[PDB]
Structure 1
Amino acid sequence: MVDYSDCFEGISGGAIFYNTKNKEYNIYNKELIETRRSPASTFKIVSTLIGLEKGVINSKESVMGYDGTEYPNKNWNKNLSLEEAFKESCVWYYKKLIDKVDAKSVQNILDDLKYGNCDISEWEGDLKNGKGHLNGFWLESSLQISPKEQVQTMAKIFEGDTNFKKEHINILRDIMKIDVNDKNINVYGKTGTGFDEKNKRVDAWFVGMLEREGDTYYFAIKSDDSNKEITGPKVKEIAINIIKKYYSV
């Protein structure tokens, strides 16, 4: 096991990196990286591929149609493209996308990906949070997946071991790219922010992969901190700091 506790700065969490070359895992906090939790918006990595496979979307410019609803997040108040919806974690766009796919198609795809518990039984999500249609099975609801399962899922998608078309995977790779101010490495990923009301802990995520000098690492950074200030964006900062200190050479 490895120790990346310095990059977490006292925040409760864990990290797992996987190299498909030597089939080796670098694990910080084994018990946490094996614990299933709601994926929150990291599910957009998979819902993007589902939409492309089913023809609901077709490109990084694809739009779903904006009904004018004024959302708290003003970055959601427009007919945004796939790329924008992914980068802004736009829930209304992805809920409208998944509502165009029958549950049987989603179930078969998650079962074939071995996506954690593959439980989409609470389709509409946890409505007792009063957010109405801004809910879904992937947002603090029935679907749960461990950080290790996220990395195993990322590896199968990007190494070409799934049924998804390489054309759709290339679209996903493009919208996942993030700027880390280091052209020697390529970082891709998706943030996730949720609060587990039952256990009173955050589900803060950053899931993706790193490409550096012929080597590829699939990773999942996760926080279960008590402090609601700990969000996906904060875990993304921790991930970049882990990458800079332990994966630069």
Structure 2
Amino acid sequence: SVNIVDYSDCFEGISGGAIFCNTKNKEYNIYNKELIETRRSPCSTFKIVSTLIGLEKGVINSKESVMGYDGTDYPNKNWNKNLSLEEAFKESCVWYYKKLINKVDAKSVQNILDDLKYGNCDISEWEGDLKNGKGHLNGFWLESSLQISPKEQVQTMAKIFEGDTNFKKEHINILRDIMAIDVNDANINVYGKTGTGFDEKNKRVDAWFVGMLEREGDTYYFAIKSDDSNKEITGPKVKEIAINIIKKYYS
């Protein structure tokens, strides 16, 4: 049962869409259907899947696992250390996940994305959008060849966390641990990841918050996405919109 809904009051004037789906009672709530079906770069939301790839291939093993920091200077304080999987995920540390993915052969990544139906599954621009000048701080998942819609994000999240993939339960639980967020409401468990990019072609942001909500037996998989032309709209801003929607409509 697909319900078209109006969450515009929570977007406080920012252009975007939201989809919340409960796979038990098959209830899909959609705000801005056209946007929810449009494929865009996942940006840092891809760290959800990249974490599972690294765990499955043995590049990392636990939420403590390290990737061998080499001393490179970065402006984010917390990137300048041999950080663990759990801290790299929470700090959205690009060098950690770039080094992780570059230890995996392209055919393995292709087959996993194909199995997950991860959007267009297009990893052809492996090294990413090099024309932005950021060099090694780039990859196929960051405003580059790989694109996925908010609906497809929710479908992927649901397949993973309902246990319908071949990923190990141990590895799923590590991901659950590191994605948990504190929304100052103990009656719901929220998990998610932000992402931020700028679509230079269309001059619009790609700002994301993707994840899941558990509340008293029911689970909702969700994706909130802005395509606003205002460059101040970031992943963290869209997460704030997402939490307001959760608190108002899913409590």
TM-score range, shorter chain: over 0.9
Unmatched segments (≥5 aa) in structure 2:
none
Structure 2: distance between partners of 1:124 and 1:72: 22
Query: How big is the shift at 1:242?
Result: 0.2
Query: How big is the shift at 1:26?
Result: 0.2
2:185 to 182, 187, 191: 182
Query: How big is the shift at 1:98?
Result: 0.4
Structure 2: distance between partners of 1:129 and 1:71: 17
Query: How big is the shift at 1:145?
Result: 0.1
Aligned residue pairs: how many?
Answer: 248
Structure 1: distance between partners of 2:6 and 2:149: 19
Cα displacement string for residues 132-160 of structure 1 (whole angstroms, at most 9, x for unaligned residues): 00000000000000000000000000001
Give the match's secondary structure for 1:16.
Answer: strand
Counterpart position of 2:43:
40
Structure 2: distance between partners of 1:161 and 1:167: 14
Cα displacement string for residues 52-111 of structure 1 (whole angstroms, at most 9, x for unaligned residues): 000000000000011111112222111110000000111100000000100000000000
Give the match's secondary structure for 1:202.
Answer: strand
Structure 2: distance between partners of 1:192 and 1:163: 25
Give the match's secondary structure for 1:124.
Answer: coil
1:173 to 149, 173, 176: 176
Matched, 1:17 2:20: yes
**What's the RMSD between the two structures over aligned residues?**
0.5
Matched, 1:5 2:5: no
Structure 2: distance between partners of 1:13 and 1:73: 29
Query: How big is the shift at 1:163?
Result: 1.1
Structure 2: distance between partners of 1:107 and 1:24: 31
Structure 2: distance between partners of 1:187 and 1:146: 21
Structure 2: distance between partners of 1:33 and 1:69: 38
Which one is further off, 65-74 or 150-159?
65-74
Give the match's secondary structure for 2:20.
Answer: strand
Give the match's secondary structure for 1:38.
Answer: coil
Query: How big is the shift at 1:186?
Result: 0.2
Query: How big is the shift at 1:246?
Result: 0.2
Deviation above 6 Å: which 4+ runs of structure 1? none
Structure 1: distance between partners of 2:183 and 2:8: 21
Structure 1: distance between partners of 2:223 and 2:160: 15
Cα displacement string for residues 193-236 of structure 1 (whole angstroms, at most 9, x for unaligned residues): 00011111000000000000111000000000011110000000
Structure 2: distance between partners of 1:232 and 1:77: 22
TM-score (norm 1): 0.99
Give the match's secondary structure for 1:109.
Answer: helix
Give the match's secondary structure for 1:221.
Answer: strand
